[PDB]
Tab-separated table of C-alpha atoms in Angstrom:
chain	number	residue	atom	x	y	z
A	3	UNK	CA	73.161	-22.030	98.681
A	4	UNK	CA	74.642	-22.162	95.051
A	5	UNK	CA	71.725	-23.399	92.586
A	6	UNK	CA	72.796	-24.602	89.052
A	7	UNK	CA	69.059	-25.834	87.447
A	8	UNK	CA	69.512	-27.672	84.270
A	9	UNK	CA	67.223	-28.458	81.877
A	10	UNK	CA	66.639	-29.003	77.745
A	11	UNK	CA	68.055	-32.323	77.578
A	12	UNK	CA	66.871	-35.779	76.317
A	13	UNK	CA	66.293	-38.087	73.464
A	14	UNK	CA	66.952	-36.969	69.860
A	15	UNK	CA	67.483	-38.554	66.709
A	16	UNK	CA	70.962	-38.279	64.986
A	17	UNK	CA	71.407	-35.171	63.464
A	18	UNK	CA	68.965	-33.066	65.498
A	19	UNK	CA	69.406	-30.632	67.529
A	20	UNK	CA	69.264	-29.155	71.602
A	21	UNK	CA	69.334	-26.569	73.641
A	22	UNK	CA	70.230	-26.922	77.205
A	23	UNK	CA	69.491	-24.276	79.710
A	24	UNK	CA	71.467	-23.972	82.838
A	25	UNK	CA	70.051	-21.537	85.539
A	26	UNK	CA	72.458	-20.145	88.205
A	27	UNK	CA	71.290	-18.615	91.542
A	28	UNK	CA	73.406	-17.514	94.732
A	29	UNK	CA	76.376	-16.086	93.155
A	30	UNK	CA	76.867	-12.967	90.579
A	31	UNK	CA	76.253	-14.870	87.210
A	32	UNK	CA	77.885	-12.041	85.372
A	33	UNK	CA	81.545	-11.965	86.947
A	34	UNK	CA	82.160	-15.813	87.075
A	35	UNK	CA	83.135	-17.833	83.647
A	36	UNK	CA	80.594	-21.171	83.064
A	37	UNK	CA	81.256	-24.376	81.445
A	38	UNK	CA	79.582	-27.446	80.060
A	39	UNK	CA	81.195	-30.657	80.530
A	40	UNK	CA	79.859	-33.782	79.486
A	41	UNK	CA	80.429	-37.753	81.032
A	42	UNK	CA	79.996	-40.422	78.434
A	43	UNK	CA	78.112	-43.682	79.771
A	44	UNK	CA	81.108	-45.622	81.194
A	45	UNK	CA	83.384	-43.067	80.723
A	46	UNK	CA	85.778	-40.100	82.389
A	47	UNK	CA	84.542	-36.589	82.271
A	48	UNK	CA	85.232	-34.047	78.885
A	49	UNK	CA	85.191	-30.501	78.583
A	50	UNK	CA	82.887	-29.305	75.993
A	51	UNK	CA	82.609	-25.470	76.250
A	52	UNK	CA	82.978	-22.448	78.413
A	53	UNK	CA	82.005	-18.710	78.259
A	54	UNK	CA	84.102	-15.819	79.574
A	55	UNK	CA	83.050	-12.935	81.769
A	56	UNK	CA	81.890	-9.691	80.087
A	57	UNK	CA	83.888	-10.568	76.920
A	58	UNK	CA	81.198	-12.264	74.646
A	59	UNK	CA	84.040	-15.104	74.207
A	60	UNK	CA	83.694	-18.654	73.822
A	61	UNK	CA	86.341	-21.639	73.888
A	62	UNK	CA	85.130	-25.433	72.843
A	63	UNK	CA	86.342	-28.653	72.413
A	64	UNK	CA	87.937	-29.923	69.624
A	65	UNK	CA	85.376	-32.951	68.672
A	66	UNK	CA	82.151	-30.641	69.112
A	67	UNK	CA	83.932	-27.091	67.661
A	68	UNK	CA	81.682	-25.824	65.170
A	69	UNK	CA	78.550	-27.724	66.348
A	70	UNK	CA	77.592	-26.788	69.759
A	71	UNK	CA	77.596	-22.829	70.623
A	72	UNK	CA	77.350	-21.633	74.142
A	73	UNK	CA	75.927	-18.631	75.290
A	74	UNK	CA	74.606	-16.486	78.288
A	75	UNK	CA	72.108	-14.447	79.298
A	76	UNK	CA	73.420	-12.579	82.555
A	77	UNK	CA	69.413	-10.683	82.655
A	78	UNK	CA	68.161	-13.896	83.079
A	79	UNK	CA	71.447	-15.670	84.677
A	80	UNK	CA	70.988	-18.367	82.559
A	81	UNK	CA	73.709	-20.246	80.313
A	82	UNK	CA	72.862	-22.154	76.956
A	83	UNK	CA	74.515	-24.880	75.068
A	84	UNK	CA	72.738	-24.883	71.640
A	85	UNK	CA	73.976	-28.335	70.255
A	86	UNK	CA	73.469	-28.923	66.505
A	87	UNK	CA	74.108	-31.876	64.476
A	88	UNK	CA	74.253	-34.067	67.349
A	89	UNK	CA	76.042	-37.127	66.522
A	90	UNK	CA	76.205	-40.610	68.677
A	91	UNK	CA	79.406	-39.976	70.628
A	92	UNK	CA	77.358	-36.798	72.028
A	93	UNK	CA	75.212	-39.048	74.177
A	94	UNK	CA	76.188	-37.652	77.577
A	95	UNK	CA	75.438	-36.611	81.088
A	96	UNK	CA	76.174	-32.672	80.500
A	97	UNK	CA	76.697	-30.555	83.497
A	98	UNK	CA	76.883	-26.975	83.889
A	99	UNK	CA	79.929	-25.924	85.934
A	100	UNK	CA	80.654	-22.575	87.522
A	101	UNK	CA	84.315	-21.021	86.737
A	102	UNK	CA	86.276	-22.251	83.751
A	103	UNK	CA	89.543	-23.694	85.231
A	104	UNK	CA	88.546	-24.894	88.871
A	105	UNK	CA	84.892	-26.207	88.800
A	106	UNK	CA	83.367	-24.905	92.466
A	107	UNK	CA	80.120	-25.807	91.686
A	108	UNK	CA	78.646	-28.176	89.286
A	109	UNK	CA	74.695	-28.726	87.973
A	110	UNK	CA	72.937	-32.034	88.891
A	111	UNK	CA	73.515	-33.330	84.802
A	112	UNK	CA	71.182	-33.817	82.604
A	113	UNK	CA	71.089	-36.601	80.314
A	114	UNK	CA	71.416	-36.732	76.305
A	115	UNK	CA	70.768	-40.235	73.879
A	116	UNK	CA	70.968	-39.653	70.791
A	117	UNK	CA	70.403	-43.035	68.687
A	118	UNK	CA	67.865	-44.610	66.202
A	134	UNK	CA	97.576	-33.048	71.682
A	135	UNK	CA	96.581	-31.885	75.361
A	136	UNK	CA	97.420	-33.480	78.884
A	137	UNK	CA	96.453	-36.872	79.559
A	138	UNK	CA	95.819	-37.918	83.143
A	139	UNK	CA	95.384	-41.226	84.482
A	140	UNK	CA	94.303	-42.218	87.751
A	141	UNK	CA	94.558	-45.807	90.170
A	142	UNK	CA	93.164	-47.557	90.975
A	143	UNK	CA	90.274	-47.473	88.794
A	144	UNK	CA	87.802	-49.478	91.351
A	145	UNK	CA	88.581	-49.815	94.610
A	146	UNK	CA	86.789	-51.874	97.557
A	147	UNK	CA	87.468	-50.993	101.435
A	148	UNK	CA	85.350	-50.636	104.650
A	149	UNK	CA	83.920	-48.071	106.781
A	150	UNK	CA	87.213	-46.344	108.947
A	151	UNK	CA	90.167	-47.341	106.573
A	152	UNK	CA	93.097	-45.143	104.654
A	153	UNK	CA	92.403	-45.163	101.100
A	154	UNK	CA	94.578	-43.749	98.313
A	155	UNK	CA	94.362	-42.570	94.807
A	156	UNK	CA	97.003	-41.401	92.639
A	157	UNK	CA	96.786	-38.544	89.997
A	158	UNK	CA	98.917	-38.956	87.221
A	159	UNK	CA	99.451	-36.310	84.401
A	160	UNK	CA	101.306	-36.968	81.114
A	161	UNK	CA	103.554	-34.101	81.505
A	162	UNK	CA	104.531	-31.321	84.621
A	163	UNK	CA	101.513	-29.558	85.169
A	164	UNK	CA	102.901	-27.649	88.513
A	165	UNK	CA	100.079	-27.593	91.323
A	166	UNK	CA	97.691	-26.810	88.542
A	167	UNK	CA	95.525	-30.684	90.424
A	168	UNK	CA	91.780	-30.436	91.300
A	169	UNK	CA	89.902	-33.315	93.262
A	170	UNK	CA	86.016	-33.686	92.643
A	171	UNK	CA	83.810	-36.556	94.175
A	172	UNK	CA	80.965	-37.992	92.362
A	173	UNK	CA	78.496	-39.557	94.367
A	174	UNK	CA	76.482	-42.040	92.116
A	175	UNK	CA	73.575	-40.103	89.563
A	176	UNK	CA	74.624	-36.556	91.496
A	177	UNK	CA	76.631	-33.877	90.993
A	178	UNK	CA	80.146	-33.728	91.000
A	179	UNK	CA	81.408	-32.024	94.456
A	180	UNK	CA	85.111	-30.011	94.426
A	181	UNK	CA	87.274	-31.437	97.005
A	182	UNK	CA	90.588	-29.879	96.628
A	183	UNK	CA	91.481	-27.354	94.371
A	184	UNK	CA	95.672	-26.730	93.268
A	185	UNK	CA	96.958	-30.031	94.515
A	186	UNK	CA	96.466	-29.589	98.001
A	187	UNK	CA	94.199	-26.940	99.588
A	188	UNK	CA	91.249	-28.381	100.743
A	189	UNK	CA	87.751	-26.143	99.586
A	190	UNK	CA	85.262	-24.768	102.016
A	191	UNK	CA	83.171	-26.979	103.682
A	192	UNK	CA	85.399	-30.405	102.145
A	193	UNK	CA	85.897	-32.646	106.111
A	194	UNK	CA	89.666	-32.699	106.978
A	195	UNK	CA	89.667	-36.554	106.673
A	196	UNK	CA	90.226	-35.225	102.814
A	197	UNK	CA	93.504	-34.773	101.926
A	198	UNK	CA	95.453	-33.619	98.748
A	199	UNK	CA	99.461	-33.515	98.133
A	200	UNK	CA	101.805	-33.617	95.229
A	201	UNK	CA	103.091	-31.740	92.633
A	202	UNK	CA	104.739	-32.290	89.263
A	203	UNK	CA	103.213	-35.268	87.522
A	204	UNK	CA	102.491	-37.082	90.598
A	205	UNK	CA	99.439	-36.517	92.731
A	206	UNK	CA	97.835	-38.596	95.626
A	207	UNK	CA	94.534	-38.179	97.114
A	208	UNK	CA	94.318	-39.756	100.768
A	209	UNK	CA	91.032	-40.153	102.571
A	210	UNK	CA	92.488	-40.920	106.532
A	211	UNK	CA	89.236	-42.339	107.767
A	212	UNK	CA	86.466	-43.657	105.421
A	213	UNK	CA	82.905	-42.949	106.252
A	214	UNK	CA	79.503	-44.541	105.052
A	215	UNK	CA	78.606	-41.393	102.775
A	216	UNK	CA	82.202	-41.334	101.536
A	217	UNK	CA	81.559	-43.963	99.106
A	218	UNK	CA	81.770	-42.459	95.698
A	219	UNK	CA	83.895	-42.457	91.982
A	220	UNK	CA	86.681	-39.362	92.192
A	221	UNK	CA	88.071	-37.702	89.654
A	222	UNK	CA	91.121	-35.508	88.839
A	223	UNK	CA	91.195	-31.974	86.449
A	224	UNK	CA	94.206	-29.979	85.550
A	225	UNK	CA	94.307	-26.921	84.199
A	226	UNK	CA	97.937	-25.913	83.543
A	227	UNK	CA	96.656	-26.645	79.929
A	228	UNK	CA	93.837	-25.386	78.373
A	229	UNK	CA	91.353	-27.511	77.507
A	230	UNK	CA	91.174	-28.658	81.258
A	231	UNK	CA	91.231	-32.929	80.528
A	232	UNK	CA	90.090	-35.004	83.465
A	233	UNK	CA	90.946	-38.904	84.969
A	234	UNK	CA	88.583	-41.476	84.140
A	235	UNK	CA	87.607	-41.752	88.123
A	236	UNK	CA	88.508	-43.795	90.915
A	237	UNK	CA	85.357	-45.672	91.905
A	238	UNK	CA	85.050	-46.623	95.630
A	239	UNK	CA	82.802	-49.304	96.722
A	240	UNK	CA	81.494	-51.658	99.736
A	241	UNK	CA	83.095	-54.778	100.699
């Protein structure tokens, strides 16, 4: 129901400059915050930017602060990244993600190459192999006591990022009940009861008792 169409990304030259254009339908673009966070090749997910509702005000990241400007255009429900003086750590998939502490719903990426403290959280395992109809288990760990402040998102492989559980340990609209989320503190466990074919994917863990939100590096879950 929820469309989030991006586009403006590619392949650019260091130094150069982009503008990514992400265009929201099925939800009023003008009361909701948006976001642009970006996964490195290899890599866990990173907040980049976010704009506020009917306050003209921006937060970014630390490493592209002063570089990349966001903006919106609730006439046209569209939000922009304009990314300037793109340098090779920018190479990215950069998604466009609705709300700016618990990500509902995320854009399909789009990709960037460019060529010629806060909460850390850290998740286990990192890969993971099991069969169709078995219990797995993934634990959430946060540097310091972020309360119930614990989202769950599952990435299946080149699509968008899906929100599973949002605060810990309520499940989201339309997540199966196989899903389950529990914890609190520091320590968080995801628990998936009965594996399923489509189930198969790399899941990642947010918090935002801090702002900037940091994310896990994933839990990838294969075939055996």
């Amino acid at each position: 129901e929820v469309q989030l169409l991006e586009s403006g990304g590619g392949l650019v030259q260091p130094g150069g400059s982009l503008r990514l254009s992400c265009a929201a339908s099925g939800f009023t673009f003008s009361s909701y915050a948006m976001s642009w966070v970006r996964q490195a090749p290899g890599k866990g997910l990173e907040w980049v930017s976010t704009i506020l509702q009917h306050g003209q005000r921006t937060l970014y990241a630390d490493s592209v602060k002063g570089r990349f400007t966001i903006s919106r255009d609730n006439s046209k429900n569209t939000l922009y990244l304009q990314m300037n003086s793109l340098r090779a750590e920018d190479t990215a998939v950069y998604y466009c993600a609705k709300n700016r502490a618990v990500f509902d719903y995320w854009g399909q990426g789009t990709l960037v190459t460019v060529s010629s403290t806060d909460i850390q959280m850290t998740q286990s395992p990192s890969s993971l192999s099991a069969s169709v109809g078995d219990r797995v288990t993934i634990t959430c760990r946060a540097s310091q006591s972020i309360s119930s402040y614990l989202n769950w998102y599952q990435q299946k492989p080149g699509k968008a990022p899906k929100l599973l559980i949002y605060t810990a340990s309520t499940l989201q609209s339309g997540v199966p009940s196989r899903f389950s989320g529990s914890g609190s503190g520091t320590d968080f466990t995801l628990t998936i009861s009965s594996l399923q074919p489509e189930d198969f994917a790399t899941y990642y863990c947010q918090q935002y008792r801090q702002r900037p939100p940091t994310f896990g590096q994933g839990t990838k879950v294969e075939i055996k």
